[model samples]
Target: NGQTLPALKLALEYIVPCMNKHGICVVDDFLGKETGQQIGDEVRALHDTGKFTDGQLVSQDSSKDIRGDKITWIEGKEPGCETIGLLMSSMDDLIRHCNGKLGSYKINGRTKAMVACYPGNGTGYVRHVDNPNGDGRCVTCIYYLNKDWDAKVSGGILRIFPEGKAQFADIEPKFDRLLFFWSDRRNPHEVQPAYATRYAITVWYFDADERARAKVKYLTGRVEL
Candidate 1:
């Protein structure tokens, strides 16, 4: 129960049901310390080098919400030991594992691997579901890179509401932790701003048809809101 990612056996036993029942699940110590630190550092480096751009905020005509921080897409098997390259490597294993059981959902939206960095103070996302339009994303997986999260200082809480239930979980963006939830346009949620830069790797699984379409877009480097 205390083990982390790379421990495939446990993930099989836990993740599926947890998500199946709650529409959300959390596993700590995921990706191990070394890999997690490597990811966080690399993300900062990318941000430092101005690689990430502003994240999109939901609206009618592909408009961006003027909140939170920025994001950069990362996904391509060009073969390398870069941070995202390393990340997608491990994540793919889990993806294949999880998808064999949970399949069938998503929007007609394009897809890619991306990172969200909510920097400085008062950077947050308003309440919204990923597949609000009900045709794009399926499962949402967010893995944390930021370590030593202090709510008093950095308050980026991922708040989620379960279907037909009260507020379920207001999760802290803890280091090396992974969170998964259904993106069925039903489980509404949002992110609160933080005092410091909050970094996380987000990979969403999609419906079969959407996944197929997303793959083509990803292959041709065509992706976005």
Candidate 2:
């Protein structure tokens, strides 16, 4: 109850500025250790049930890939993903408060969430944009769930390129780290193949207008990847 203020301040003073300037922002310890642990366990339980499928590479409006990750789309209202729902709720309010713009990026209330795992088999994705064709998702938000990560052992680092920059930055899959960026193709990123299993919850948000194009209803807790 008393913690909301700190979150607001952090968003305003730090996160927002980073997004506007760099097109990406990485927040360490965005989720408390306890909260992260709980969510991680829930995600693991789902994965253990053998529900996750190979991550797709969408090209020409169809499924495609060299897949390094397994994914299971999540709906906020579900049995095991309650905390994820809370994250969306918070994001909704924050986006609205920030005038619906993450820098030049805009987003709305509804979002698509998923839990992705890298199985440490020397597999990883190549550089790509989220909505390469446009009119799809506008932002990419990720919550990493790997614990005690070391780049040497668990190497699924998310590498992102800044606008007009030649070099890229490699982000670690440290527990509870929150990473977000515009899905508008300004930031092209990829996952470094992991030597050990790495887990993360990734989400995408669209402008409310795009919601009508989606035939599947959310909150049913039954969306398939």
Candidate 3:
């Protein structure tokens, strides 16, 4: 519990200011290679067992062309999930850091862990904003779990179209890489078609005011991702 806090604290030091400046920040080696591999293995095993379902938008049916990935939700407390559980418990440090450095963000609740796998063979997600409808999501944190990623490949890149910028940023889904960005309209992003399996897990923090205003219900255990 305590050990992860320091690492997330360092990430926040960069995330806070970068988020304010451009609405996104990325930290490589967020946890460690070992942790990433462990999580990745867990994801692969779950997927192989047919545990992951097709990805979908909020309260909507899945569209293959729009978002082609398999997903499963996690509470991070299940057996053999200690690494992910540690990651979840350490996220409060991020909320606190934001409220202190980026003004009164007032994040209240968080969504359960959404572990996703983009199966190799041209699977990808179309460009879109996560909180286009303002479902109370404020900040989004995603951890990449793919190991031995080759930058030479054309796919599996996370391309972001930041607000007010003509050019987009390309982020690789490398092992132990953690990316943070606003969940609102400020960040419009997509995943390029992957040549190899890509694993990632995301957790979204909710805005206190937005949740009350929108009457948002948070995702609990084992729901569609």
In candidate 1, which residue pairs clash? 57-65, 105-207, 106-135, 106-136, 107-135, 107-136, 107-137, 108-135
Alpha-carbon local distance difference test for all models: 0.71, 0.73, 0.77
Which residue runs does candidate 2 get wrong by more than 4 Å? 1-5, 54-67, 208-225
lDDT of 3 by residue, 61-157 (tens): 3443444687888898887677777777766566665674643577888999999888776767889999988688888889888888885673799
In the range 1-225, model 2's lDDT, one tens digit per residue, is 012235667577766777777778777777688887888888888788887896544333234335568888888788877887776666565556655446554555545677788878778778888866655477787888888999887678889876688888788888878877887678888888788888888777776555444434333346578
Ranking by lDDT: 3, 2, 1
Model 1 ranges with Cα > 4 A deviation: 5-7, 54-67, 76-81, 103-110, 209-225
Question: Evaluated with lDDT, which candidate comes out highest?
Answer: 3
Per-residue lDDT of model 1, residues 81-109, tens digit only: 27667666566666566655553442233
Each prediction's RMSD over C-alphas, in Å, is 6.1, 6.9, 6.1
Task: After the best TM-score superposition of candidate 3, give how far the Cα of residue 149 lies from its true spot, in angstroms.
Answer: 0.9
TM-score of 2: 0.81
Better candidate number, 2 or 3, judged by TM-score: 3
- The TM-scores of all predictions, comma-separated, are 0.79, 0.81, 0.83
